[PDB]
Paper text:
Integrin α6β4 is a major component of hemidesmosomes that mediate the stable anchorage of epithelial cells to the underlying basement membrane. The β4 subunit only pairs with the α6 subunit to form the α6β4 integrin, which is a laminin receptor required for maintaining the integrity of epithelia. The third and fourth fibronectin type III domains ([name]-3,4) of integrin β4 mediate binding to the hemidesmosomal proteins BPAG1e and BPAG2, and participate in signalling. The crystal structures of the individual [name]-3 and [name]-4 domains were solved and the relative arrangement of the [name] domains was elucidated by combining [name] with site-directed spin labelling.
The structure of the [name]-4 domain (1572–1666) was refined against data extending to 1.50 Å resolution; the [name]-4 crystals contain a single protein molecule in the asymmetric unit. In contrast to [name]-3, the region around Y1642 is mostly uncharged. In contrast to Y1494 and Y1526 in [name]-3, Y1642 in [name]-4 sits in a wider pocket surrounded by uncharged residues. Therefore, phosphorylation of Y1642 is less likely to destabilize [name]-4 and correlates with a minor role of Y1642 in the recruitment of Shc.
Numbering used by the authors: 1570 to 1666
Write the structure that this text describes.
Amino acid sequence: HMSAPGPLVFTALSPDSLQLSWERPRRPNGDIVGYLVTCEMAQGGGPATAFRVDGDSPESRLTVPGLSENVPYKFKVQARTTEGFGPEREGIITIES
């Protein structure tokens, strides 16, 4: 999926927050203007948080708070282009300590 963001890289910062990073799509389908990051418990049924990332970068980083430990979170990152959204890159992360 070359139009999708690179694989998500999770850097857990604390019991309740992590940094998510991703490389821009190797082959964007359109002009990337930002990203959409959506976070929710992987098990579903939970609240989702959407983060609108403004702009593009070879690698983008986002700190995502309001998490918890021992709960897998599913992150979905899509490039925002001038024409729409690119395909999602998904990544699941659990923070333990």
